[PDB]
Every structure is written in structure tokens, then in C-alpha cells.
PDB file of C-alpha atoms in Angstrom:
ATOM      1  CA  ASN A 282     -79.285  47.877  70.015  1.00 47.11           C
ATOM      2  CA  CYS A 283     -77.760  45.339  67.527  1.00 47.73           C
ATOM      3  CA  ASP A 284     -75.903  42.063  68.289  1.00 46.89           C
ATOM      4  CA  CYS A 285     -78.893  40.161  66.865  1.00 46.18           C
ATOM      5  CA  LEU A 286     -78.760  36.391  67.387  1.00 47.93           C
ATOM      6  CA  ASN A 287     -80.388  33.396  65.728  1.00 47.87           C
ATOM      7  CA  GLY A 288     -80.687  34.810  62.223  1.00 48.24           C
ATOM      8  CA  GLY A 289     -82.024  38.204  63.322  1.00 48.70           C
ATOM      9  CA  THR A 290     -81.203  41.299  61.253  1.00 50.86           C
ATOM     10  CA  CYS A 291     -80.177  44.710  62.621  1.00 52.83           C
ATOM     11  CA  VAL A 292     -82.449  47.208  60.936  1.00 50.08           C
ATOM     12  CA  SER A 293     -82.264  50.948  61.347  1.00 50.49           C
ATOM     13  CA  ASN A 294     -85.002  52.851  63.087  1.00 50.00           C
ATOM     14  CA  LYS A 295     -87.428  54.368  60.620  1.00 46.79           C
ATOM     15  CA  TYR A 296     -87.807  57.712  62.492  1.00 44.89           C
ATOM     16  CA  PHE A 297     -84.643  58.158  64.519  1.00 45.23           C
ATOM     17  CA  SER A 298     -81.062  58.617  63.349  1.00 46.75           C
ATOM     18  CA  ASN A 299     -78.544  56.197  64.877  1.00 43.53           C
ATOM     19  CA  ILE A 300     -80.999  53.796  66.505  1.00 44.86           C
ATOM     20  CA  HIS A 301     -81.227  50.169  65.380  1.00 41.95           C
ATOM     21  CA  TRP A 302     -83.337  47.189  66.428  1.00 42.54           C
ATOM     22  CA  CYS A 303     -83.314  43.395  65.780  1.00 42.13           C
ATOM     23  CA  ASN A 304     -85.844  42.088  63.298  1.00 40.83           C
ATOM     24  CA  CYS A 305     -86.256  38.476  64.456  1.00 42.11           C
ATOM     25  CA  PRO A 306     -87.346  35.397  62.599  1.00 44.38           C
ATOM     26  CA  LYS A 307     -90.847  34.398  63.856  1.00 42.24           C
ATOM     27  CA  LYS A 308     -89.572  31.524  66.041  1.00 42.50           C
ATOM     28  CA  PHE A 309     -87.388  33.947  68.097  1.00 42.74           C
ATOM     29  CA  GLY A 310     -88.085  36.924  70.335  1.00 40.09           C
ATOM     30  CA  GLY A 311     -86.259  39.338  72.557  1.00 41.96           C
ATOM     31  CA  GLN A 312     -84.214  42.462  72.107  1.00 40.63           C
ATOM     32  CA  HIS A 313     -81.456  40.277  70.580  1.00 40.06           C
ATOM     33  CA  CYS A 314     -83.682  37.461  69.228  1.00 38.71           C
ATOM     34  CA  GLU A 315     -82.190  35.523  72.178  1.00 37.19           C
ATOM     35  CA  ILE A 316     -85.270  33.516  73.188  1.00 35.94           C
ATOM     36  CA  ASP A 317     -86.368  30.524  71.121  1.00 37.92           C
ATOM     37  CA  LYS A 318     -90.129  30.718  71.427  1.00 38.49           C
ATOM     38  CA  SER A 319     -90.980  27.455  69.672  1.00 40.35           C
ATOM     39  CA  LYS A 320     -88.324  24.793  70.495  1.00 37.42           C
ATOM     40  CA  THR A 321     -89.666  21.952  72.636  1.00 39.00           C
ATOM     41  CA  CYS A 322     -86.495  19.850  72.994  1.00 37.54           C
ATOM     42  CA  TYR A 323     -82.688  20.234  72.993  1.00 37.69           C
ATOM     43  CA  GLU A 324     -80.078  18.929  70.540  1.00 36.27           C
ATOM     44  CA  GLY A 325     -76.814  17.213  71.492  1.00 33.31           C
ATOM     45  CA  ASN A 326     -75.920  18.369  75.031  1.00 30.86           C
ATOM     46  CA  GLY A 327     -78.217  21.420  74.726  1.00 32.44           C
ATOM     47  CA  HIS A 328     -75.234  23.727  75.005  1.00 28.77           C
ATOM     48  CA  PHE A 329     -77.046  26.103  72.652  1.00 26.90           C
ATOM     49  CA  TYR A 330     -80.606  25.345  73.768  1.00 24.14           C
ATOM     50  CA  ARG A 331     -82.474  28.673  74.117  1.00 23.43           C
ATOM     51  CA  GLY A 332     -86.086  27.597  74.643  1.00 17.56           C
ATOM     52  CA  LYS A 333     -88.497  28.291  77.441  1.00 15.94           C
ATOM     53  CA  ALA A 334     -88.355  25.056  79.549  1.00 15.32           C
ATOM     54  CA  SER A 335     -88.181  26.152  83.229  1.00 18.17           C
ATOM     55  CA  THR A 336     -88.815  22.963  85.303  1.00 19.64           C
ATOM     56  CA  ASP A 337     -86.270  20.467  86.730  1.00 17.83           C
ATOM     57  CA  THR A 338     -86.645  16.686  86.422  1.00 17.76           C
ATOM     58  CA  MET A 339     -88.293  16.609  89.871  1.00 15.92           C
ATOM     59  CA  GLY A 340     -91.062  18.989  88.754  1.00 13.55           C
ATOM     60  CA  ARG A 341     -89.635  22.046  90.574  1.00 14.76           C
ATOM     61  CA  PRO A 342     -89.444  25.574  89.040  1.00 14.50           C
ATOM     62  CA  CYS A 343     -86.038  26.876  88.021  1.00 15.31           C
ATOM     63  CA  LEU A 344     -84.811  29.982  89.813  1.00 18.80           C
ATOM     64  CA  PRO A 345     -84.513  33.129  87.653  1.00 17.82           C
ATOM     65  CA  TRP A 346     -80.962  33.917  86.417  1.00 20.46           C
ATOM     66  CA  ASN A 347     -81.437  37.454  87.853  1.00 23.80           C
ATOM     67  CA  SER A 348     -82.777  36.413  91.273  1.00 26.01           C
ATOM     68  CA  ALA A 349     -80.670  37.701  94.182  1.00 23.89           C
ATOM     69  CA  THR A 350     -79.579  34.136  95.040  1.00 21.93           C
ATOM     70  CA  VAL A 351     -78.469  33.088  91.483  1.00 20.18           C
ATOM     71  CA  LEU A 352     -76.632  36.428  91.212  1.00 16.57           C
ATOM     72  CA  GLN A 353     -74.345  35.018  93.946  1.00 14.00           C
ATOM     73  CA  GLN A 354     -73.600  31.809  92.001  1.00 11.70           C
ATOM     74  CA  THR A 355     -71.230  31.088  89.144  1.00 13.06           C
ATOM     75  CA  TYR A 356     -73.749  31.462  86.315  1.00 14.33           C
ATOM     76  CA  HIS A 357     -76.157  34.404  86.285  1.00 17.74           C
ATOM     77  CA  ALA A 358     -77.708  37.245  84.250  1.00 20.78           C
ATOM     78  CA  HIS A 359     -75.141  39.926  85.280  1.00 21.81           C
ATOM     79  CA  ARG A 360     -72.140  38.087  83.766  1.00 20.18           C
ATOM     80  CA  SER A 361     -70.354  39.949  80.946  1.00 20.50           C
ATOM     81  CA  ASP A 362     -71.048  36.930  78.682  1.00 18.01           C
ATOM     82  CA  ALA A 363     -74.653  36.486  79.849  1.00 17.85           C
ATOM     83  CA  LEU A 364     -76.118  37.171  76.375  1.00 18.66           C
ATOM     84  CA  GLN A 365     -73.926  34.632  74.651  1.00 14.85           C
ATOM     85  CA  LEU A 366     -74.824  32.131  77.385  1.00 13.04           C
ATOM     86  CA  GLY A 367     -78.563  32.803  77.183  1.00 12.10           C
ATOM     87  CA  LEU A 368     -78.695  33.910  80.812  1.00  7.95           C
ATOM     88  CA  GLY A 369     -81.253  36.676  81.124  1.00  9.04           C
ATOM     89  CA  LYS A 370     -84.230  37.979  83.061  1.00  6.83           C
ATOM     90  CA  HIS A 371     -86.002  34.615  82.923  1.00  7.62           C
ATOM     91  CA  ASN A 372     -85.820  31.161  84.618  1.00  9.41           C
ATOM     92  CA  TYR A 373     -85.223  29.051  81.538  1.00 10.40           C
ATOM     93  CA  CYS A 374     -83.000  25.947  81.379  1.00  9.38           C
ATOM     94  CA  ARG A 375     -79.525  26.610  80.009  1.00 11.18           C
ATOM     95  CA  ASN A 376     -76.152  24.864  79.749  1.00  9.42           C
ATOM     96  CA  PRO A 377     -73.364  27.447  80.097  1.00  9.09           C
ATOM     97  CA  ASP A 378     -70.754  24.960  81.345  1.00  8.23           C
ATOM     98  CA  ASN A 379     -71.429  22.297  78.720  1.00  6.24           C
ATOM     99  CA  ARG A 380     -72.916  19.602  80.942  1.00  7.28           C
ATOM    100  CA  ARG A 381     -74.574  16.560  79.262  1.00  9.07           C
ATOM    101  CA  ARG A 382     -77.973  18.373  79.230  1.00 10.23           C
ATOM    102  CA  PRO A 383     -79.701  21.722  80.131  1.00  7.38           C
ATOM    103  CA  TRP A 384     -80.082  22.666  83.805  1.00  8.47           C
ATOM    104  CA  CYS A 385     -80.980  25.522  86.143  1.00  9.00           C
ATOM    105  CA  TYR A 386     -80.538  26.414  89.809  1.00  6.28           C
ATOM    106  CA  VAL A 387     -83.382  25.204  91.950  1.00  7.55           C
ATOM    107  CA  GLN A 388     -84.079  26.251  95.535  1.00  6.14           C
ATOM    108  CA  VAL A 389     -83.566  23.023  97.574  1.00  7.65           C
ATOM    109  CA  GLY A 390     -84.165  23.953 101.217  1.00  7.01           C
ATOM    110  CA  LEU A 391     -81.429  26.411 102.136  1.00  3.36           C
ATOM    111  CA  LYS A 392     -79.358  26.498  98.927  1.00  2.00           C
ATOM    112  CA  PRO A 393     -79.754  26.878  95.166  1.00  2.94           C
ATOM    113  CA  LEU A 394     -78.553  23.666  93.558  1.00  4.33           C
ATOM    114  CA  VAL A 395     -77.751  22.852  89.896  1.00  3.20           C
ATOM    115  CA  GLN A 396     -80.520  20.516  88.786  1.00  3.04           C
ATOM    116  CA  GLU A 397     -81.137  18.968  85.353  1.00  2.00           C
ATOM    117  CA  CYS A 398     -84.133  20.139  83.358  1.00  2.22           C
ATOM    118  CA  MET A 399     -87.196  18.134  82.467  1.00  4.86           C
ATOM    119  CA  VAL A 400     -86.812  19.058  78.683  1.00  3.14           C
ATOM    120  CA  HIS A 401     -86.228  16.080  76.389  1.00  2.00           C
ATOM    121  CA  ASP A 402     -83.594  15.420  73.741  1.00  2.33           C
ATOM    122  CA  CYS A 403     -85.021  16.003  70.225  1.00  2.87           C
ATOM    123  CA  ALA A 404     -83.697  12.465  69.394  1.00  2.00           C
TER     124      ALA A 404
END
């Protein structure tokens, strides 16, 4: 694949014709450099936060974006724009609808509910 994010570079495969991969800067990982491995806070509203925070403000684990239950909600990993939104096979806090700060679905009794993430503002 290509479509390399976050300053990644599509490089061609050394042994195979017509294959490419993303060479990522060291702070990023993933097939598209889509995971920020080092960021510990969000900037602004965290609309483009891509770190690995995965706990809500009540100390509960976020549900994975590819869990059966999240797959039935508005925002999930099978969306056509899931890459651009940072929604993948992980349970990390995101902000696809431009709320005031990152959030994730959390299982609260019977239903998954949008809950704000524990992650702090870099400010």
C-alpha cells in the first residue's frame, strides 16, 4: 500500500515489482503511519489526535472501533473514511465529529456510550 500519513514516504519494495510500503518517521507506526506512538496529549480539540490513549475520564477502557457493537454505531473502523478519521483495529481515543476533546465508545451497562477520554490537553 501507499496513502502514507504523518510525514511517511511511500517507498517501492526492494524485491517485488509494483509493491510499495510506508516508511514512517520514528514517532509513527502502522501500515499508513496512522498511529502516533509517542504523543501523550492532544492539541486544540484533538480533532487530529492519533495517539494511544484508550481510557475514559471515569477510568473505563474504550471499546475497540472494530468491535461488533461499535460497528453498529455512527463512528467505526469499517467506514469508508475510517483511515482519515483514525478509526482502526484499536480502542484509541479519537474525535471524528469535532467535539471539544477526544472520546471513545464505552460499554455502560447495556449500551455503548460516547465518553470523553482521560488524555490531557498539551496546554
